[PDB]
PDB file of all heavy atoms in Angstrom:
ATOM      1  N   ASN A  13       2.228   0.936 -14.596  1.00  0.00           N
ATOM      2  CA  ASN A  13       2.605  -0.065 -13.546  1.00  0.00           C
ATOM      3  C   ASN A  13       1.758  -1.232 -13.801  1.00  0.00           C
ATOM      4  O   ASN A  13       0.535  -1.200 -13.965  1.00  0.00           O
ATOM      5  CB  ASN A  13       2.341   0.558 -12.149  1.00  0.00           C
ATOM      6  CG  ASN A  13       3.104   1.676 -11.837  1.00  0.00           C
ATOM      7  OD1 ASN A  13       2.684   2.796 -12.046  1.00  0.00           O
ATOM      8  ND2 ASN A  13       4.340   1.410 -11.145  1.00  0.00           N
ATOM      9  N   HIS A  15       0.715  -3.488 -11.755  1.00  0.00           N
ATOM     10  CA  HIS A  15      -0.262  -3.689 -10.708  1.00  0.00           C
ATOM     11  C   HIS A  15      -1.459  -2.694 -10.762  1.00  0.00           C
ATOM     12  O   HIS A  15      -2.516  -2.962 -10.099  1.00  0.00           O
ATOM     13  CB  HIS A  15       0.350  -3.605  -9.361  1.00  0.00           C
ATOM     14  CG  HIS A  15       0.750  -2.289  -8.895  1.00  0.00           C
ATOM     15  ND1 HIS A  15       1.903  -1.727  -9.150  1.00  0.00           N
ATOM     16  CD2 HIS A  15       0.124  -1.430  -7.992  1.00  0.00           C
ATOM     17  CE1 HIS A  15       2.066  -0.529  -8.541  1.00  0.00           C
ATOM     18  NE2 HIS A  15       0.918  -0.359  -7.815  1.00  0.00           N
ATOM     19  N   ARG A  32       9.497  -6.541 -13.030  1.00  0.00           N
ATOM     20  CA  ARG A  32       9.759  -5.089 -13.163  1.00  0.00           C
ATOM     21  C   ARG A  32       8.510  -4.206 -12.766  1.00  0.00           C
ATOM     22  O   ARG A  32       8.674  -3.034 -12.779  1.00  0.00           O
ATOM     23  CB  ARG A  32      10.117  -4.760 -14.475  1.00  0.00           C
ATOM     24  CG  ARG A  32      11.397  -5.555 -15.011  1.00  0.00           C
ATOM     25  CD  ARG A  32      11.778  -5.238 -16.585  1.00  0.00           C
ATOM     26  NE  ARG A  32      12.039  -3.805 -16.790  1.00  0.00           N
ATOM     27  CZ  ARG A  32      12.871  -3.419 -17.673  1.00  0.00           C
ATOM     28  NH1 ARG A  32      13.525  -4.231 -18.466  1.00  0.00           N
ATOM     29  NH2 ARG A  32      13.047  -2.015 -17.882  1.00  0.00           N
ATOM     30  N   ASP A  33       7.399  -4.804 -12.585  1.00  0.00           N
ATOM     31  CA  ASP A  33       6.208  -4.028 -12.324  1.00  0.00           C
ATOM     32  C   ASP A  33       5.717  -3.298 -13.478  1.00  0.00           C
ATOM     33  O   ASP A  33       5.181  -2.163 -13.374  1.00  0.00           O
ATOM     34  CB  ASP A  33       6.170  -3.217 -11.007  1.00  0.00           C
ATOM     35  CG  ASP A  33       4.826  -2.522 -10.683  1.00  0.00           C
ATOM     36  OD1 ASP A  33       3.771  -3.140 -10.734  1.00  0.00           O
ATOM     37  OD2 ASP A  33       4.811  -1.277 -10.396  1.00  0.00           O
ATOM     38  N   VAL A  78      11.727  -5.890  -2.331  1.00  0.00           N
ATOM     39  CA  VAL A  78      10.480  -5.159  -2.213  1.00  0.00           C
ATOM     40  C   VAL A  78       9.487  -5.941  -1.282  1.00  0.00           C
ATOM     41  O   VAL A  78       9.237  -7.011  -1.661  1.00  0.00           O
ATOM     42  CB  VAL A  78       9.752  -4.839  -3.636  1.00  0.00           C
ATOM     43  CG1 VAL A  78       8.455  -4.102  -3.264  1.00  0.00           C
ATOM     44  CG2 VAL A  78      10.643  -3.884  -4.456  1.00  0.00           C
ATOM     45  N   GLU A  79       9.131  -5.321  -0.171  1.00  0.00           N
ATOM     46  CA  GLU A  79       8.144  -6.006   0.770  1.00  0.00           C
ATOM     47  C   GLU A  79       6.862  -6.458   0.181  1.00  0.00           C
ATOM     48  O   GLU A  79       6.478  -5.943  -0.782  1.00  0.00           O
ATOM     49  CB  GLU A  79       7.706  -4.831   1.876  1.00  0.00           C
ATOM     50  CG  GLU A  79       8.918  -4.322   2.608  1.00  0.00           C
ATOM     51  CD  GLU A  79       9.304  -5.264   3.713  1.00  0.00           C
ATOM     52  OE1 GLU A  79      10.227  -6.157   3.422  1.00  0.00           O
ATOM     53  OE2 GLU A  79       8.886  -5.216   4.843  1.00  0.00           O
ATOM     54  N   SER A  81       3.060  -7.047  -0.665  1.00  0.00           N
ATOM     55  CA  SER A  81       1.906  -6.144  -0.804  1.00  0.00           C
ATOM     56  C   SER A  81       0.647  -6.941  -1.288  1.00  0.00           C
ATOM     57  O   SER A  81       0.785  -8.199  -1.514  1.00  0.00           O
ATOM     58  CB  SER A  81       2.232  -5.079  -1.840  1.00  0.00           C
ATOM     59  OG  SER A  81       2.192  -5.556  -3.102  1.00  0.00           O
ATOM     60  N   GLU A  82      -0.446  -6.347  -1.357  1.00  0.00           N
ATOM     61  CA  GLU A  82      -1.635  -6.960  -1.833  1.00  0.00           C
ATOM     62  C   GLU A  82      -1.541  -7.308  -3.428  1.00  0.00           C
ATOM     63  O   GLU A  82      -2.358  -8.120  -3.994  1.00  0.00           O
ATOM     64  CB  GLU A  82      -2.894  -6.145  -1.754  1.00  0.00           C
ATOM     65  CG  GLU A  82      -3.223  -5.964  -0.251  1.00  0.00           C
ATOM     66  CD  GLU A  82      -3.489  -4.488   0.121  1.00  0.00           C
ATOM     67  OE1 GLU A  82      -2.985  -3.596  -0.539  1.00  0.00           O
ATOM     68  OE2 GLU A  82      -4.151  -4.230   1.200  1.00  0.00           O
ATOM     69  N   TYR A  83      -0.498  -6.914  -4.137  1.00  0.00           N
ATOM     70  CA  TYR A  83      -0.340  -7.155  -5.533  1.00  0.00           C
ATOM     71  C   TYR A  83       0.823  -8.100  -5.873  1.00  0.00           C
ATOM     72  O   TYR A  83       0.716  -8.903  -6.742  1.00  0.00           O
ATOM     73  CB  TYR A  83      -0.050  -5.760  -6.277  1.00  0.00           C
ATOM     74  CG  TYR A  83      -1.071  -4.645  -6.102  1.00  0.00           C
ATOM     75  CD1 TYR A  83      -0.754  -3.709  -5.050  1.00  0.00           C
ATOM     76  CD2 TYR A  83      -2.144  -4.667  -6.785  1.00  0.00           C
ATOM     77  CE1 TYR A  83      -1.623  -2.693  -4.786  1.00  0.00           C
ATOM     78  CE2 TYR A  83      -3.067  -3.561  -6.495  1.00  0.00           C
ATOM     79  CZ  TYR A  83      -2.757  -2.632  -5.626  1.00  0.00           C
ATOM     80  OH  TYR A  83      -3.760  -1.566  -5.376  1.00  0.00           O
ATOM     81  N   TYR A  84       1.753  -8.219  -5.032  1.00  0.00           N
ATOM     82  CA  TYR A  84       2.830  -9.241  -5.069  1.00  0.00           C
ATOM     83  C   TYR A  84       3.347  -9.796  -3.742  1.00  0.00           C
ATOM     84  O   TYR A  84       3.281  -9.113  -2.771  1.00  0.00           O
ATOM     85  CB  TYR A  84       4.196  -8.490  -5.717  1.00  0.00           C
ATOM     86  CG  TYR A  84       3.920  -7.776  -7.025  1.00  0.00           C
ATOM     87  CD1 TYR A  84       3.891  -6.370  -7.156  1.00  0.00           C
ATOM     88  CD2 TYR A  84       3.907  -8.496  -8.254  1.00  0.00           C
ATOM     89  CE1 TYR A  84       3.805  -5.802  -8.291  1.00  0.00           C
ATOM     90  CE2 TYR A  84       3.799  -7.774  -9.414  1.00  0.00           C
ATOM     91  CZ  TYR A  84       3.771  -6.400  -9.423  1.00  0.00           C
ATOM     92  OH  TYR A  84       3.585  -5.692 -10.652  1.00  0.00           O
ATOM     93  N   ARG A  87       9.521 -10.101  -2.856  1.00  0.00           N
ATOM     94  CA  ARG A  87      10.438 -10.394  -3.947  1.00  0.00           C
ATOM     95  C   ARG A  87      11.366  -9.352  -4.305  1.00  0.00           C
ATOM     96  O   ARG A  87      11.320  -8.218  -3.778  1.00  0.00           O
ATOM     97  CB  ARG A  87       9.367 -10.683  -5.120  1.00  0.00           C
ATOM     98  CG  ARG A  87       8.981  -9.315  -5.729  1.00  0.00           C
ATOM     99  CD  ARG A  87       7.705  -9.366  -6.487  1.00  0.00           C
ATOM    100  NE  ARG A  87       7.653  -8.563  -7.689  1.00  0.00           N
ATOM    101  CZ  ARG A  87       7.472  -7.112  -7.655  1.00  0.00           C
ATOM    102  NH1 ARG A  87       7.308  -6.530  -6.445  1.00  0.00           N
ATOM    103  NH2 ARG A  87       7.414  -6.379  -8.626  1.00  0.00           N
ATOM    104  N   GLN A  89      12.612  -6.903  -7.068  1.00  0.00           N
ATOM    105  CA  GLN A  89      11.953  -6.260  -8.275  1.00  0.00           C
ATOM    106  C   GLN A  89      13.185  -5.886  -9.057  1.00  0.00           C
ATOM    107  O   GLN A  89      14.167  -5.294  -8.394  1.00  0.00           O
ATOM    108  CB  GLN A  89      11.195  -4.994  -7.853  1.00  0.00           C
ATOM    109  CG  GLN A  89      10.750  -4.259  -9.061  1.00  0.00           C
ATOM    110  CD  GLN A  89       9.640  -3.317  -8.927  1.00  0.00           C
ATOM    111  OE1 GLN A  89       8.518  -3.755  -8.221  1.00  0.00           O
ATOM    112  NE2 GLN A  89       9.457  -2.157  -9.446  1.00  0.00           N
ATOM    113  N   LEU A  92      15.013  -1.456 -11.068  1.00  0.00           N
ATOM    114  CA  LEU A  92      14.492  -0.543  -9.985  1.00  0.00           C
ATOM    115  C   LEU A  92      15.583   0.415  -9.608  1.00  0.00           C
ATOM    116  O   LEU A  92      16.644   0.000  -9.390  1.00  0.00           O
ATOM    117  CB  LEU A  92      13.895  -1.257  -8.785  1.00  0.00           C
ATOM    118  CG  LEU A  92      13.112  -0.496  -7.769  1.00  0.00           C
ATOM    119  CD1 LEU A  92      11.909   0.233  -8.330  1.00  0.00           C
ATOM    120  CD2 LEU A  92      12.598  -1.298  -6.585  1.00  0.00           C
ATOM    121  N   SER A  99       6.978   9.120  -1.430  1.00  0.00           N
ATOM    122  CA  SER A  99       6.148   8.322  -2.303  1.00  0.00           C
ATOM    123  C   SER A  99       5.237   7.485  -1.431  1.00  0.00           C
ATOM    124  O   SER A  99       5.620   6.872  -0.601  1.00  0.00           O
ATOM    125  CB  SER A  99       6.923   7.277  -3.048  1.00  0.00           C
ATOM    126  OG  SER A  99       6.336   6.230  -3.786  1.00  0.00           O
ATOM    127  N   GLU A 100       3.873   7.755  -1.637  1.00  0.00           N
ATOM    128  CA  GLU A 100       2.892   6.907  -0.973  1.00  0.00           C
ATOM    129  C   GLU A 100       1.879   6.230  -2.059  1.00  0.00           C
ATOM    130  O   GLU A 100       2.240   6.451  -3.376  1.00  0.00           O
ATOM    131  CB  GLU A 100       1.900   7.773   0.010  1.00  0.00           C
ATOM    132  CG  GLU A 100       1.752   9.224  -0.322  1.00  0.00           C
ATOM    133  CD  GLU A 100       1.081   9.892   0.883  1.00  0.00           C
ATOM    134  OE1 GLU A 100      -0.020   9.673   1.289  1.00  0.00           O
ATOM    135  OE2 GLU A 100       1.802  10.772   1.400  1.00  0.00           O
ATOM    136  N   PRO A 101       1.222   5.190  -1.826  1.00  0.00           N
ATOM    137  CA  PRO A 101       0.572   4.328  -2.827  1.00  0.00           C
ATOM    138  C   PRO A 101       0.026   4.944  -4.139  1.00  0.00           C
ATOM    139  O   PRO A 101       0.424   4.355  -5.281  1.00  0.00           O
ATOM    140  CB  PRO A 101      -0.532   3.520  -2.118  1.00  0.00           C
ATOM    141  CG  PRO A 101      -0.163   3.532  -0.557  1.00  0.00           C
ATOM    142  CD  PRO A 101       0.959   4.658  -0.280  1.00  0.00           C
ATOM    143  N   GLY A 102      -0.770   5.885  -4.059  1.00  0.00           N
ATOM    144  CA  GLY A 102      -1.304   6.599  -5.213  1.00  0.00           C
ATOM    145  C   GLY A 102      -0.237   7.282  -6.024  1.00  0.00           C
ATOM    146  O   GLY A 102      -0.641   7.970  -7.140  1.00  0.00           O
ATOM    147  N   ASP A 103       0.961   7.350  -5.584  1.00  0.00           N
ATOM    148  CA  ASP A 103       1.989   8.009  -6.385  1.00  0.00           C
ATOM    149  C   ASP A 103       2.540   7.256  -7.491  1.00  0.00           C
ATOM    150  O   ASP A 103       3.186   7.748  -8.325  1.00  0.00           O
ATOM    151  CB  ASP A 103       3.271   8.548  -5.402  1.00  0.00           C
ATOM    152  CG  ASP A 103       2.730   9.596  -4.627  1.00  0.00           C
ATOM    153  OD1 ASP A 103       2.000  10.467  -5.164  1.00  0.00           O
ATOM    154  OD2 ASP A 103       3.191   9.794  -3.443  1.00  0.00           O
ATOM    155  N   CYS A 104       2.263   5.947  -7.555  1.00  0.00           N
ATOM    156  CA  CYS A 104       2.796   5.122  -8.695  1.00  0.00           C
ATOM    157  C   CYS A 104       2.276   5.612  -9.982  1.00  0.00           C
ATOM    158  O   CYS A 104       1.136   6.017 -10.111  1.00  0.00           O
ATOM    159  CB  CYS A 104       2.436   3.606  -8.428  1.00  0.00           C
ATOM    160  SG  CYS A 104       3.206   2.844  -7.190  1.00  0.00           S
ATOM    161  N   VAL A 118       7.243   6.034 -10.988  1.00  0.00           N
ATOM    162  CA  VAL A 118       7.189   5.638  -9.664  1.00  0.00           C
ATOM    163  C   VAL A 118       6.593   4.182  -9.555  1.00  0.00           C
ATOM    164  O   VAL A 118       5.595   3.886 -10.102  1.00  0.00           O
ATOM    165  CB  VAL A 118       6.384   6.567  -8.880  1.00  0.00           C
ATOM    166  CG1 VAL A 118       6.199   6.115  -7.468  1.00  0.00           C
ATOM    167  CG2 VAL A 118       7.126   8.051  -8.735  1.00  0.00           C
ATOM    168  N   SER A 119       7.192   3.375  -8.759  1.00  0.00           N
ATOM    169  CA  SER A 119       6.670   1.998  -8.625  1.00  0.00           C
ATOM    170  C   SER A 119       6.814   1.544  -7.089  1.00  0.00           C
ATOM    171  O   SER A 119       5.795   0.682  -6.846  1.00  0.00           O
ATOM    172  CB  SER A 119       7.567   1.017  -9.476  1.00  0.00           C
ATOM    173  OG  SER A 119       7.269  -0.317  -9.420  1.00  0.00           O
ATOM    174  N   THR A 120       7.629   2.091  -6.342  1.00  0.00           N
ATOM    175  CA  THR A 120       7.658   1.696  -4.742  1.00  0.00           C
ATOM    176  C   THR A 120       7.844   3.030  -4.049  1.00  0.00           C
ATOM    177  O   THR A 120       8.243   4.120  -4.341  1.00  0.00           O
ATOM    178  CB  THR A 120       8.775   0.704  -4.565  1.00  0.00           C
ATOM    179  OG1 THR A 120      10.001   1.532  -4.545  1.00  0.00           O
ATOM    180  CG2 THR A 120       8.875  -0.439  -5.476  1.00  0.00           C
ATOM    181  N   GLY A 121       7.564   2.830  -2.625  1.00  0.00           N
ATOM    182  CA  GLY A 121       7.831   3.967  -1.764  1.00  0.00           C
ATOM    183  C   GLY A 121       7.959   3.441  -0.246  1.00  0.00           C
ATOM    184  O   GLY A 121       8.147   2.232  -0.097  1.00  0.00           O
ATOM    185  N   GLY A 122       7.781   4.350   0.613  1.00  0.00           N
ATOM    186  CA  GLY A 122       7.926   3.984   2.093  1.00  0.00           C
ATOM    187  C   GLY A 122       9.304   4.202   2.665  1.00  0.00           C
ATOM    188  O   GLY A 122      10.229   4.116   1.900  1.00  0.00           O
ATOM    189  N   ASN A 123       9.412   4.516   4.001  1.00  0.00           N
ATOM    190  CA  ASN A 123      10.694   4.744   4.732  1.00  0.00           C
ATOM    191  C   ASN A 123      11.488   5.900   4.156  1.00  0.00           C
ATOM    192  O   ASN A 123      12.716   5.894   4.234  1.00  0.00           O
ATOM    193  CB  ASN A 123      11.605   3.626   4.584  1.00  0.00           C
ATOM    194  CG  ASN A 123      11.149   2.348   5.528  1.00  0.00           C
ATOM    195  OD1 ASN A 123      10.308   2.577   6.416  1.00  0.00           O
ATOM    196  ND2 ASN A 123      11.438   1.134   5.113  1.00  0.00           N
ATOM    197  N   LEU A 125      11.920   6.804   0.956  1.00  0.00           N
ATOM    198  CA  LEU A 125      12.456   6.458  -0.362  1.00  0.00           C
ATOM    199  C   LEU A 125      11.343   6.281  -1.366  1.00  0.00           C
ATOM    200  O   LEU A 125      10.318   6.090  -1.005  1.00  0.00           O
ATOM    201  CB  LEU A 125      13.140   5.083  -0.121  1.00  0.00           C
ATOM    202  CG  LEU A 125      14.329   4.869   0.857  1.00  0.00           C
ATOM    203  CD1 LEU A 125      14.615   3.442   1.136  1.00  0.00           C
ATOM    204  CD2 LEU A 125      15.539   5.647   0.423  1.00  0.00           C
TER     205      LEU A 125
HETATM  206  N1  LIG B   1       6.371  -2.323  -7.176  1.00  0.00           N
HETATM  207  C1  LIG B   1       5.648  -2.855  -6.131  1.00  0.00           C
HETATM  208  O1  LIG B   1       5.772  -4.017  -5.722  1.00  0.00           O
HETATM  209  C2  LIG B   1       4.686  -1.941  -5.425  1.00  0.00           C
HETATM  210  C3  LIG B   1       3.311  -2.601  -5.595  1.00  0.00           C
HETATM  211  C4  LIG B   1       2.187  -1.512  -4.700  1.00  0.00           C
HETATM  212  C5  LIG B   1       2.728  -1.369  -3.329  1.00  0.00           C
HETATM  213  N2  LIG B   1       4.121  -0.904  -3.234  1.00  0.00           N
HETATM  214  C6  LIG B   1       4.686   0.051  -2.632  1.00  0.00           C
HETATM  215  O2  LIG B   1       5.852   0.222  -2.354  1.00  0.00           O
HETATM  216  C7  LIG B   1       3.695   1.278  -2.412  1.00  0.00           C
HETATM  217  C8  LIG B   1       3.715   2.128  -3.806  1.00  0.00           C
HETATM  218  C9  LIG B   1       3.717   3.697  -3.578  1.00  0.00           C
HETATM  219  N3  LIG B   1       4.617   3.984  -2.453  1.00  0.00           N
HETATM  220  C10 LIG B   1       4.403   3.362  -1.211  1.00  0.00           C
HETATM  221  N4  LIG B   1       4.692   3.816  -0.076  1.00  0.00           N
HETATM  222  N5  LIG B   1       4.415   2.871   0.908  1.00  0.00           N
HETATM  223  C11 LIG B   1       4.081   1.893   0.230  1.00  0.00           C
HETATM  224  C12 LIG B   1       4.044   2.155  -1.227  1.00  0.00           C
HETATM  225  C13 LIG B   1       5.044  -1.915  -3.883  1.00  0.00           C
END
Side-chain angles (χ1 to χ4, degrees):
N13 294 89
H15 75 275
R32 298 178 63 154
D33 184 45
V78 175
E79 298 283 88
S81 75
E82 296 126 339
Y83 308 96
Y84 306 102
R87 75 206 213 284
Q89 175 159 319
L92 186 59
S99 168
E100 35 191 293
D103 288 325
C104 289
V118 173
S119 175
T120 75
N123 291 332
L125 299 164

